[PDB]
Every structure is written in structure tokens, then in C-alpha cells.
């Protein structure tokens, strides 16, 4: 069935990920020095290569392999459009390793052929809560809190193999040899999401979208006039009201975030996290990089009152190409990313997110059924999409979790 996960230190069927009861490495404890020091073999026509990501050139050439060849829905009505900006937002954070950037190129004119990216993150990735119960029934509460300590592992994305190369069993040897810079750095886990189905996720759950330009999004038979909505005399109008949202926030105190903001931003989020079962956990300088508004790439609002910041709210844009479709090339989509809120309700909160990213020309709100994501679904009009997010980690077993026990939010 999977002639690579097979060979791989992940939970390997649904059954095992049932049976497991504590956080913790799967395979043998091994050190740097048992790790090969040279890359993985690859056929002689083809090379490894680190891309500088400080380096216009070298972001491009990603950027334009990922706009190509990277990921669409099942219906090919989609592939994201990750902007040069975003890429260098997302893929060199604080402490960032240049090595856990891995490419393939053809040797002979240096044409990207493949990528797969790392990056570090501090994840707080011990037994949940309700094995933790069950194990102080068992008599069991040392080995089950053994890992609780917010471990520093590798997050895993924008895995892309070009199109003319796909089913060549290209993808294993980029995961080996990633998996090898690794842990040359002595890091044994990592987190990694996917649409798709592998050996085996530790939570998945739906993406839900919120119309913000209904005209739009039907232009792109995405919506379409909805079939619900045909038995109206006036379908667009009708479609329009049921979305349009007010033109400037209601919440008294909002504004952007600035950086003298990042002590408290840190504090009421870190206090908001630390009641899932999976979640990082952000220097001042990880809050500053992922939430100062960064233009084009990251929104961020905060809510102070009486100076004091005790509500905010991220998001980031990522764009779509829209397949087949000429008239309409690009979706512009803004994802929900972190928040907190601790003087209004969510809905309230994450309002004021969708009026501002309206009134900045954004086409749809996204986002996965993670953190409180469900408590405002109803009321501020998202519907669940085709599609779900899977959850997974490399080297560490773990019981099946709801999505609402997940805080890490994938870009
Ligand atoms: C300690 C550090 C560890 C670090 C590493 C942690 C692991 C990170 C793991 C990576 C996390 C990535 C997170 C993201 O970025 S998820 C986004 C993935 N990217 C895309 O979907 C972009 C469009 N598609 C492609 O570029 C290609 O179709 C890819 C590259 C996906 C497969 O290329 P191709 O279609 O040319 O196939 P192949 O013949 O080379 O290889 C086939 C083998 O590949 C397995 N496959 C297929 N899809 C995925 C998938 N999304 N994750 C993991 N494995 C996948 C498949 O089951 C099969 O294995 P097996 O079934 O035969 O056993
Ligand atoms: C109009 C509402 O739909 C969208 O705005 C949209 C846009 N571009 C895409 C591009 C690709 C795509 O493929 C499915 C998919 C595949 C992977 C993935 N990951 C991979 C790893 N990193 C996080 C996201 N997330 C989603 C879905 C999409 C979707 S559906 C998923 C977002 C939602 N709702
Ligand atoms: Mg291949």
C-alpha cells in the first residue's frame, strides 16, 4: 500500500492511533553523529540545492516552481498563489536553519524541479488532557506527563514536486534528505499538515469559508448563486445582503498592532494557548516576526483600552489562481490566523476581522475548525467547505485529538 510511510517512523493505521495512549518518540533513540554527513544519492542529472532566502533571485525561483505546480483542490478549481513576500515572511522566521530549506535542480541549466521547507517551532506536544485522566486511573502520571516540556522541532511545508516529474518517487527521496538536515541538527519530531490522507494523522478537521464579495466568488462558479438560492426572485441581491458587512470596526479600542505591543500580544495569547493540547509557544521575537502587520502578507489588529491590549486578531493573505478561468485569474483569500479575546465574545473579535479584511479587498475568509474557530461559525456566516486539514507528526505518537484541541495554525 505505501512503499515509503511504511518505512517511516509514523503511526501506521487508524487502529495504532487508537491504541496510543501517551505522548513520545516512536523510533530508537539515535544521535548526530549516527546521522549520514552527506546528502541522500540523487541520479547524476539532478542536484541538491540550499536557495538563499535572503536572495530576490533564489525566492523567485521558488515562488514561481510553487505557482506552477503546487497544491489544488480535488476539483482543479484552485492552486495557490504564495506571494515572494509571504514566502520570505514564512520561511525564515527567528532562528530560522538555511539547511532545513531543501531544492532539487536539474544540474544542467539549474531549472527547480522540487522543494520541500523546514522551519523551527516550539511546540508544546505532550499526552492531552483526557489520556492525562485516564492515566491517573492507571496509577500512571510520570510516564504520561514525561514529555510535557515545549519541545523545538521542525515544521514541514510547501513539499512540491513539478508537474513533469510527478509519480517518479521524487517526494520520499526530498522528505529523506530533509528528514537527514534535521536531525544533523539533533531535532527527531516534526508537525506537518495536509489536505490529503497518509499514515496518519493525530486530528483533522474541516475548513469552513466566509463570503466577503459574493458578486466575485460566483463569477467563479466557486458559490455560483449557490443552488439554495435559486428559488429567489433576485438571486445576487439577495446573495450580497446576506453578506455584506459594515465598513469600518465597531469595537472601540481597535487599531493595528504596533511593536511596543508585543509584550501584552505575547502574554494574552500565550494565556489563550495554554488551554489546548497542542500548541506553540512564541518568543517576543516569533510574536514579532508572525503578527507585526507586514504589508500584503500579515494583518493585525489589537483591541486597547485604557493602554492595555486585551483583545487581538491576525490573519494573512494568500491568493489563488482561479483555473480556467480568464476573466477572473486570482481569488484573493484572507486565512483567520491567531487571536485572543478576553473583553468580548469571539464573534464579536473576529467580526471586526472580516470587516476589516472586506474593506481591504479581500474576496473570502478561510479558515480550519482549530482553536474556537466552531464558536463563531453560525453567527458570522461561514459554511463549511470540501476540504478538510490533516494533522500530523514525524517520530511522535499521539492520541487522536479533536481539531478544537489543536492552536497551531499552518500556513
Ligand atoms: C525529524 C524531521 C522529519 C522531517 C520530515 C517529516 C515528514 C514530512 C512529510 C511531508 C509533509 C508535506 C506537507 C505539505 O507540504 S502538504 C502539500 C503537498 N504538496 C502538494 O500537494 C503540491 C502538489 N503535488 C506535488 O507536488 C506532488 O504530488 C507531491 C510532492 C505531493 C507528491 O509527489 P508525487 O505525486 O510526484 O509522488 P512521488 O512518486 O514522488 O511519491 C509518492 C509517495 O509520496 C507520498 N505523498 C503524496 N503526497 C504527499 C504529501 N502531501 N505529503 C507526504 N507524502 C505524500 C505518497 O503517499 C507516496 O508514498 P507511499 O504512499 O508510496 O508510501
Ligand atoms: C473559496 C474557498 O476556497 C478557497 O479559498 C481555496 C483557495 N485555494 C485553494 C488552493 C488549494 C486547495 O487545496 C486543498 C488544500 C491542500 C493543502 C492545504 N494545506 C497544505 C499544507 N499547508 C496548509 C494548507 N490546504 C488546502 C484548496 C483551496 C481552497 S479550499 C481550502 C481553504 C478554504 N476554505
Ligand atoms: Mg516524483
Redesign the pocket.
Given at each position: 500500500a505505501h512503499a515509503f510511510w511504511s518505512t517511516q517512523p509514523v503511526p501506521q493505521t487508524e487502529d495504532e492511533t487508537e491504541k496510543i495512549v501517551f505522548a513520545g518518540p516512536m523510533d530508537e533513540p539515535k544521535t548526530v553523529a549516527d546521522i549520514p554527513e552527506e546528502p541522500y544519492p540523487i541520479a547524476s542529472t539532478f542536484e541538491w540545492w540550499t536557495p538563499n532566502m535572503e536572495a530576490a533571485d533564489d525566492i523567485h525561483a521558488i515562488y514561481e516552481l510553487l505557482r506552477d505546480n503546487?497544491?489544488?483542490?480535488?476539483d482543479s478549481?484552485?492552486?495557490?498563489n504564495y506571494s515572494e513576500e509571504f514566502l520570505q515572511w514564512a520561511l525564515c522566521p527567528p532562528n530560522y536553519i538555511p539547511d532545513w530549506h531543501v531544492a532539487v535542480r536539474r544540474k544542467a541549466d539549474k531549472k527547480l524541479l522540487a522543494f520541500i521547507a523546514g522551519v523551527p517551532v516550539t511546540l508544546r506536544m505532550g499526552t492531552p488532557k483526557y489520556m492525562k485522566v485516564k492515566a491517573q486511573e492507571k496509577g500512571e502520571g510520570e510516564e504520561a506527563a514525561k514529555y510535557d516540556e515545549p519541545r523545538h522541532i521542525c515544521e514541514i511545508?510547501?513539499?512540491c514536486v513539478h508537474k513533469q516529474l510527478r509519480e517518479k518517487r521524487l517526494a520520499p527521496i526530498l522528505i529523506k534528505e530533509a528528514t537527514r538536515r534535521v536531525n544533523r541538527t539533533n531535532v527527531w519530531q516534526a508537525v506537518?499538515?495536509?489536505?490529503?490522507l497518509l499514515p496518519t494523522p493525530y486530528a483533522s478537521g474541516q475548513?469552513?469559508?466566509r463570503?466577503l464579495n459574493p458578486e466575485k466568488?460566483v463569477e467563479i462558479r466557486?458559490?455560483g448563486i449557490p443552488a439554495q438560492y435559486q428559488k429567489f426572485q433576485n438571486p445576487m441581491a439577495m446573495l450580497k445582503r446576506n453578506y455584506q458587512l459594515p465598513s469600518a470596526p465597531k469595537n472601540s479600542g481597535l487599531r493595528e498592532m504596533k511593536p511596543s505591543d508585543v509584550p501584552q500580544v505575547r502574554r494574552i495569547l500565550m494565556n489563550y494557548l495554554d488551554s489546548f493540547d497542542v500548541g506553540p509557544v512564541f518568543s517576543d521575537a516569533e510574536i514579532s516576526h508572525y503578527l507585526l502587520p507586514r504589508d500584503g502578507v500579515v494583518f493585525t489588529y489589537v483591541v486597547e483600552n485604557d493602554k492595555k491590549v486585551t483583545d487581538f486578531f491576525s490573519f494573512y493573505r494568500?491568493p489563488?489562481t482561479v483555473i480556467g478561468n480568464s476573466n477572473y485569474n486570482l481569488?484573493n483569500?484572507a486565512?483567520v490566523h491567531y487571536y485572543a479575546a478576553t473583553s468580548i465574545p469571539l464573534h464579536q473579535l473576529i467580526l471586526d476581522l472580516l470587516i476589516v479584511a472586506h474593506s481591504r479587498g479581500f474576496?473570502?475568509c478561510?479558515?480550519?475548525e482549530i482553536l474556537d474557530n466552531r464558536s463563531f461559525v453560525e453567527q458570522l456566516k461561514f459554511g463549511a467547505?470540501?476540504?478538510h486539514?490533516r494533522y500530523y507528526f514525524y517520530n511522535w505518537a499521539y492520541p487522536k485529538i479533536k481539531p478544537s484541541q489543536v492552536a497551531l495554525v499552518?500556513?
Open positions: 503546487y497544491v489544488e483542490d480535488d478549481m484552485f492552486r495557490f511545508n510547501f513539499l506537518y499538515t495536509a489536505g490529503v475548513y469552513f469559508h463570503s466568488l466557486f458559490s494568500i489563488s481569488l483569500a486565512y474576496d473570502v478561510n479558515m480550519v467547505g470540501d476540504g486539514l499552518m500556513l
